[PDB]
Amino acid sequence: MKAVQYTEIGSEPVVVDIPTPTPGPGEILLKVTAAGLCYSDIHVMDMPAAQYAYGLPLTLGHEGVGTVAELGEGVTGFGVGDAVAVYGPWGCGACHACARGRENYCTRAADLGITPPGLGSPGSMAEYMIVDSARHLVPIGDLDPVAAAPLTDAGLTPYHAISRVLPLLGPGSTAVVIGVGGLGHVGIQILRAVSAARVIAVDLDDDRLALAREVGADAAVKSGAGAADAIRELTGGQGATAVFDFVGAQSTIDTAQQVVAVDGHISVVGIHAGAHAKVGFFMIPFGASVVTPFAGTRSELMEVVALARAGRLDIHTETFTLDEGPAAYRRLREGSIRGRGVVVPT
Amino acid sequence: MKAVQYTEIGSEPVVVDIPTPTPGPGEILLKVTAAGLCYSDIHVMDMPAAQYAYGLPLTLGHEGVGTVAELGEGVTGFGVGDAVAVYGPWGCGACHACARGRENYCTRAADLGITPPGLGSPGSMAEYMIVDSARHLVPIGDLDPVAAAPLTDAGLTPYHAISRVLPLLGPGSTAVVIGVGGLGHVGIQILRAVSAARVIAVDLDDDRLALAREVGADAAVKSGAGAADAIRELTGGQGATAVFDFVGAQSTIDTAQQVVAVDGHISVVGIHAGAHAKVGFFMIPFGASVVTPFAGTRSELMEVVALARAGRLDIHTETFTLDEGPAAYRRLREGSIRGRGVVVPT
Amino acid sequence: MKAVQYTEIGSEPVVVDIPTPTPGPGEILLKVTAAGLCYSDIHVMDMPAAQYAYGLPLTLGHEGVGTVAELGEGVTGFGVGDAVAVYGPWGCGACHACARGRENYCTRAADLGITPPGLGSPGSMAEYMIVDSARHLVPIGDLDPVAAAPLTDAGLTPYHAISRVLPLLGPGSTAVVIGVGGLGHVGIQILRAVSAARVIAVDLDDDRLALAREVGADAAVKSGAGAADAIRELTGGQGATAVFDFVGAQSTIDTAQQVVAVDGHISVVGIHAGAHAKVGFFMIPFGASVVTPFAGTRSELMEVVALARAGRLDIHTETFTLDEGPAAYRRLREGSIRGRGVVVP
Amino acid sequence: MKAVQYTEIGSEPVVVDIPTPTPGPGEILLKVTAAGLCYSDIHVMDMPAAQYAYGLPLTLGHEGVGTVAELGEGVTGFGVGDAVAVYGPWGCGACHACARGRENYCTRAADLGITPPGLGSPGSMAEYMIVDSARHLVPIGDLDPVAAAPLTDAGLTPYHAISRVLPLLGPGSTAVVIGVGGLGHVGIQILRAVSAARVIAVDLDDDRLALAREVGADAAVKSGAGAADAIRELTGGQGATAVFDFVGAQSTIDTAQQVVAVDGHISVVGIHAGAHAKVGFFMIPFGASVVTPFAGTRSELMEVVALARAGRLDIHTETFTLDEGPAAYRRLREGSIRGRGVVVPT
Numbered sequence A, B, D: 001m002k003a004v005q006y007t008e009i010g011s012e013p014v015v016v017d018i019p020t021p022t023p024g025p026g027e028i029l030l031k032v033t034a035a036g037l038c039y040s041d042i043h044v045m046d047m048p049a050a051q052y053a054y055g056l057p058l059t060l061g062h063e064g065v066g067t068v069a070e071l072g073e074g075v076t077g078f079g080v081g082d083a084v085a086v087y088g089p090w091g092c093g094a095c096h097a098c099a100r101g102r103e104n105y106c107t108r109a110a111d112l113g114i115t116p117p118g119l120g121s122p123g124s125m126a127e128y129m130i131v132d133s134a135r136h137l138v139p140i141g142d143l144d145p146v147a148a149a150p151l152t153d154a155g156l157t158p159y160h161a162i163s164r165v166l167p168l169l170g171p172g173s174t175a176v177v178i179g180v181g182g183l184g185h186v187g188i189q190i191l192r193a194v195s196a197a198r199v200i201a202v203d204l205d206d207d208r209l210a211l212a213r214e215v216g217a218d219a220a221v222k223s224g225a226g227a228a229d230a231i232r233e234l235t236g237g238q239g240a241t242a243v244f245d246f247v248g249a250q251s252t253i254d255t256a257q258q259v260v261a262v263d264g265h266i267s268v269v270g271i272h273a274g275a276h277a278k279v280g281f282f283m284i285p286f287g288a289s290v291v292t293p294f295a296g297t298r299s300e301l302m303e304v305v306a307l308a309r310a311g312r313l314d315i316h317t318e319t320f321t322l323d324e325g326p327a328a329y330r331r332l333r334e335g336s337i338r339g340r341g342v343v344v345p346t
Numbered sequence C: 001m002k003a004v005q006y007t008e009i010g011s012e013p014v015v016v017d018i019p020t021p022t023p024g025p026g027e028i029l030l031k032v033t034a035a036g037l038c039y040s041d042i043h044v045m046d047m048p049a050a051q052y053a054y055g056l057p058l059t060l061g062h063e064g065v066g067t068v069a070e071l072g073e074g075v076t077g078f079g080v081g082d083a084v085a086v087y088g089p090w091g092c093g094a095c096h097a098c099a100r101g102r103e104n105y106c107t108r109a110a111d112l113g114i115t116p117p118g119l120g121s122p123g124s125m126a127e128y129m130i131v132d133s134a135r136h137l138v139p140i141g142d143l144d145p146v147a148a149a150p151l152t153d154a155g156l157t158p159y160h161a162i163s164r165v166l167p168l169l170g171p172g173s174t175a176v177v178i179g180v181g182g183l184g185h186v187g188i189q190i191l192r193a194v195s196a197a198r199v200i201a202v203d204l205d206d207d208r209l210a211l212a213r214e215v216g217a218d219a220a221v222k223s224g225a226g227a228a229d230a231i232r233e234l235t236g237g238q239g240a241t242a243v244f245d246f247v248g249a250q251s252t253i254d255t256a257q258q259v260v261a262v263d264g265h266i267s268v269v270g271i272h273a274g275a276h277a278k279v280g281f282f283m284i285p286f287g288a289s290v291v292t293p294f295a296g297t298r299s300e301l302m303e304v305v306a307l308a309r310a311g312r313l314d315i316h317t318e319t320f321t322l323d324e325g326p327a328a329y330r331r332l333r334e335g336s337i338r339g340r341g342v343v344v345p
């Protein structure tokens, strides 16, 4: 089969031909219908050799949707042809966190050699992919695969981040979304669907601010030195109940600390190495909590899919072939994909 | 009446004679039965002239218990002689936070000129004190006033901090308490009363570690460079579900970050100017939230009092006269009060 | 001033002339801009003499909005002219429930002689009204008073009921609303604003089903013997995550028990004497909780007002003068007010 | 092997000899170390032929602990010899409830033919037993199996019931426990470990009231016509925050409704056919919720085991051999087991 792989440190990923895998016991083989590109893949490919630990070659793609092609020995609960989304952050399944479906916060996975697809195990940017266990598949019915693939991370991650503090976001609350890309543009729509928060979007790029308004942001503010004052102006001096920072640069985290309300929340979701919130007296308001959330839970993925099926998430995508995979990653690096890049194998 | 006041910047507080106040409409005059000394009073007295904003002179004492002496015009809900604790963090009473009793997180108080007793308004270290409103008194019944006075901050503040994350502290959880002084020694006992968490206490002083074990800590370990490794040894490498840092120095916050579990919590309660947690990817575990909580809520103070009345809180105190007030503050500076210093007026 | 009062047991309320009150210390006098009619007023007026305990005469109206006219001695936090809504379920202000703003669940109010406006103390169906304390006023800014008055109960009560189980109502959930009247039509809109629940409305009247669809219900079905099967058909046999019964008759509670999901909720909000859910093994699904909620909290009223100010609540009203007050109550009895009746002085 | 089976409708269970089973793929064979008797087994054996639906013969025992004897094909996560408790309420593992570990509330199990051990599938009252999947085992380490077996239902069920409303049970709260038998005597101890509630126990039998005090009840009241007034006397007229009714007869549910506080809770846990709470205006206080909970969740079972391992649960048992199984069930019927009956195979 055709796949897109990261094959040597510092180089662009390449289109390859590798064997179509066969499922062992408990496993499922999917025919991939859509594979999302996430900016996390760029963080991974930019790691120096000393930091990089996922093995070479590596089939990319941690956002995967497909149809069941072959059942491994013992597998029931899915039929051949079933449309499924892949739950990404694989855990041990047995610990206290995993028993609640919170496999994103499993502490045993590393020691057991469990790695996620596209980030240690073979990903979804290929004609076919293996899934380790039935509990890591979620049915999607007749959902369009292209709009469905991003739900598995661009949807799941903001959904989880928002869910951690959803009781704060009552009528009268304000939520700030910093970064209107793959994650951010879905985050705005989740906020609108599950809360009565007023949503203020923040981005460097005017066209992303337009995207923000298109998907339901109440206001849009230019990022940078003026953002904090502009946000406070909109919130009448009380600040924002919650800030969801999908950039996570030091400048955006600083903006978040300068606008968050007393007894509010900052969720540092975007990854920028070295950047951090400074949580201490006189540097942040009383009662304003800060966290770096990771991925999401099994039941949260089901909820994201339910939002999509109810028509609550308009996922903005651009489609690419497998051959266009390396080019699509260049587009993501330069910031020219309006929403989520998705590879459709054929 | 006799009172202890901070009268000039940089100097020790002094015993003074000032008029016994009379309550205006809505106010209550208390005969003070006990007034706690909090290390926050030392932070206040160590502020340079440029930072200090509470006015001079200032009657100290933000931990107050008394008996109702005189009702101001229009006051109902209390009779002369009723034993009451003073709710410290006065708010506007009208905003969304105050409507839930969360006057500790009121955003309107500053602009309305509302200041707390002992920290802008006259405190409890005097024979008598004014309380602005009936809603800032809580009945204590026959509770010993000396052990009751610390409940209003040494009790309330750890109670609130713990309450923010109480659902995390189920059976199998571990809570670390850093700093076994006024706040910390009460915090250990709250954890034992309201959760099934295993409690690990941390302090510089071996006698405070003994205090920790006396009030129910399951383990007590020496603070400093070795503390993080010793705590991890006790938690089997998973780390601590929650860390309540009642010191809040950079070294203790660093210890907290090095031991906190995935999806855990650090509560930075102690105040050490410039110290802060660094909340960013690779600097803290995924899902570990951090906050600087402040004081507590009206209903939380009632719950603290209920714990005391049920025999769940053994409050360690040393008693001082009003004349010994300045000496008691020197004792607090040097770290020689085993628990909470309390002034009893006579 | 002119007021509408219940004056003798069994009779219709009457328009009267009574003195304009003056505020004592701590009190506020409002010029009333809008006063809602609630079907609870009909329950009260239909009480026999033995049951009725609110005193005669009684100025009706537990849904009140006004402008501050006079401050009593010592009152701060409001200026003359401020537009305010009245928080209805007055409590002692001092107990553990009241300290959290949950004065709707205060246990001390009765013994202290605290009664709510329109239900023991003088209500809002008058040119002016007294409010006991500043904490029982909530600012409404430039909100239209006519659409604002129902927020104080038609809004507050469903808001509280929904709020008790809001964490159940995630994406993929279903909420059933039984009774699309004053309360129900606002409840549909609250569900849409604060949850991703799919909303199924139930009513006897086809025009109320149309109202339900107008304010955002995803489906609207006829009440009665066929309702339970029709709801199950819509939910694919799993049933409804939550049922908010704003009728509360035995037949509607039975429908609720026949459709509620495992680990779901029934909120019995409407009042029908003797009617009750039967909560026991084999009579209801495992984990399905049932409650009769009452009114709402201080912070909940603020949230309802915030929803109204954000344009999330389209409150359907019909306006009446004080003189038309008795006629408006006849209209409410016969079921001919499409939404909430409101009296404007 | 030797087993205790229900073999014909209306008759006592009998000791039998049946083949030692072999595990299919995904299954685990346990050597049973302890098997609890639950009063639910008596409800089942008292069902008329028309109602009874679990098949004949049926190996009894839905409270099971053992050691792993043989792994079925593909099973990982356990070694031969590991001491484990059996999670009883088996679900499909795939639905939204099961994804959160809430297999007790799975809606798909019936249609998929999934039945629990001792209640449709073969139970633990035998030398060996099959478990369907690894996710239905929980490690117990060196816990005494005899005291561990009741944790799987006598522990789990009260734990879940209490957990549903744990945020109500703050300092100052009161919890009533009706019925101090297998479940009730563990329920008292859970309340003491995870809350600061004052605990009032209610039973018909004075010796069970003594048991209640032995395991930490603050007060003990005789059940019957006087119970409601005696409970109100103890709660000062406000009533009980929560009532956990482990009898569930109409008389005990009536007592519960007559004592529950405004904004409180009644949990109807015990099963008595036809008995029900009457939830309507003027028949129950405002805001007092009522529910019939069922069993518990995967993570809750882990928490119960963690309580046992921390020394928080003193489980009162009487031990029986397999041959004494039928006699033990007669003892349970007549109410002469002081706590939980447990069968130890040899």
Ligand SMILES: NC(=O)c1ccc[n+]([C@@H]2O[C@H](COP(=O)([O-])OP(=O)(O)OC[C@H]3O[C@@H](n4cnc5c(N)ncnc54)[C@H](O)[C@@H]3O)[C@@H](O)[C@H]2O)c1
Residues within 6 Å of the ligand: A037, A038, A039, A040, A043, A153, A154, A157, A178, A179, A180, A181, A182, A183, A184, A202, A203, A204, A205, A208, A223, A224, A246, A247, A248, A249, A251, A252, A269, A270, A271, A272, A292, A293, A294, A295, A332, A335, A339
């Ligand atoms: N925590 C997790 O579990 C998790 C999961 C997935 C992705 N991520 C991270 O989320 C981040 C975003 O990923 P994506 O796929 O949405 O990226 P993207 O490239 O699709 O979107 C980036 C967006 O951020 C905007 N942006 C960049 N700098 C900005 C600034 N200073 N101020 C305001 N806006 C700015 C861009 O204009 C663009 O709109 C990445 O760092 C990614 O690694 C985290």
Ligand SMILES: NC(=O)c1ccc[n+]([C@@H]2O[C@H](COP(=O)([O-])OP(=O)(O)OC[C@H]3O[C@@H](n4cnc5c(N)ncnc54)[C@H](O)[C@@H]3O)[C@@H](O)[C@H]2O)c1
Residues within 6 Å of the ligand: B037, B038, B039, B040, B043, B153, B154, B157, B178, B179, B180, B181, B182, B183, B184, B202, B203, B204, B205, B208, B223, B224, B246, B247, B248, B249, B251, B252, B268, B269, B270, B271, B272, B292, B293, B294, B295, B332, B335, B339
């Ligand atoms: N956040 C709030 O609302 C709030 C409220 C009250 C007090 N506080 C703050 O809490 C802190 C504690 O106040 P207190 O009155 O309990 O003080 P205290 O002097 O009574 O107790 C201090 C304790 O901390 C220990 N300690 C000091 N340095 C340490 C270190 N590096 N490692 C371990 N232990 C150490 C001491 O040995 C002593 O036992 C103060 O900074 C105070 O201002 C905060």
Ligand SMILES: NC(=O)c1ccc[n+]([C@@H]2O[C@H](COP(=O)([O-])OP(=O)(O)OC[C@H]3O[C@@H](n4cnc5c(N)ncnc54)[C@H](O)[C@@H]3O)[C@@H](O)[C@H]2O)c1
Residues within 6 Å of the ligand: C037, C038, C039, C040, C043, C153, C154, C157, C178, C179, C180, C181, C182, C183, C184, C202, C203, C204, C205, C208, C223, C224, C246, C247, C248, C249, C251, C252, C268, C269, C270, C271, C272, C293, C294, C295, C332, C335, C339
């Ligand atoms: N719990 C509380 O705190 C509280 C507060 C306020 C009002 N209430 C009660 O809520 C109930 C509704 O109040 P309202 O002011 O909205 O009444 P309303 O007269 O405005 O509306 C009643 C609606 O119910 C519908 N209806 C009547 N019987 C029905 C049935 N069997 N099935 C389906 N629909 C039916 C009508 O067609 C109408 O649309 C009343 O019983 C009132 O006393 C309770």
Ligand SMILES: NC(=O)c1ccc[n+]([C@@H]2O[C@H](COP(=O)([O-])OP(=O)(O)OC[C@H]3O[C@@H](n4cnc5c(N)ncnc54)[C@H](O)[C@@H]3O)[C@@H](O)[C@H]2O)c1
Residues within 6 Å of the ligand: D037, D038, D039, D040, D041, D043, D153, D154, D157, D178, D179, D180, D181, D182, D183, D184, D202, D203, D204, D205, D208, D223, D224, D246, D247, D248, D249, D251, D252, D268, D269, D270, D271, D272, D292, D293, D294, D295, D332, D335, D339
């Ligand atoms: N909801 C569930 O998931 C679930 C799970 C397990 C058991 N159960 C049920 O819980 C109940 C208790 O089970 P168990 O095994 O502890 O029973 P058990 O026979 O060990 O204990 C019964 C206890 O209740 C007491 N009692 C009986 N009638 C009483 C009354 N009127 N007032 C006060 N006390 C009374 C007895 O004196 C005894 O102490 C049974 O009905 C059982 O079927 C329910």
Ligand SMILES: [K+]
Residues within 6 Å of the ligand: A191, A192, A193, A194, A195, A196, C192, C193, C194, C195
């Ligand atoms: K919404």
Ligand SMILES: [K+]
Residues within 6 Å of the ligand: B191, B192, B193, B194, B195, B196, D192, D193, D194, D195
């Ligand atoms: K405890």
Ligand SMILES: [Zn+2]
Residues within 6 Å of the ligand: A038, A039, A040, A041, A062, A153
């Ligand atoms: Zn990603």
Ligand SMILES: [Zn+2]
Residues within 6 Å of the ligand: A091, A092, A093, A094, A095, A096, A097, A098, A103, A106, A107, A108, A109
């Ligand atoms: Zn795990």
Ligand SMILES: [Zn+2]
Residues within 6 Å of the ligand: B038, B039, B040, B041, B062, B153
């Ligand atoms: Zn202090």
Ligand SMILES: [Zn+2]
Residues within 6 Å of the ligand: B091, B092, B093, B094, B095, B096, B097, B098, B103, B106, B107, B108, B109
């Ligand atoms: Zn305030």
Ligand SMILES: [Zn+2]
Residues within 6 Å of the ligand: C038, C039, C040, C041, C062, C153
């Ligand atoms: Zn009403």
Ligand SMILES: [Zn+2]
Residues within 6 Å of the ligand: C091, C092, C093, C094, C095, C096, C097, C098, C103, C106, C107, C108, C109
């Ligand atoms: Zn009250």
Ligand SMILES: [Zn+2]
Residues within 6 Å of the ligand: D038, D039, D040, D041, D062, D153
């Ligand atoms: Zn059982």
Ligand SMILES: [Zn+2]
Residues within 6 Å of the ligand: D091, D092, D093, D094, D095, D096, D097, D098, D103, D106, D107, D108, D109
């Ligand atoms: Zn299931």
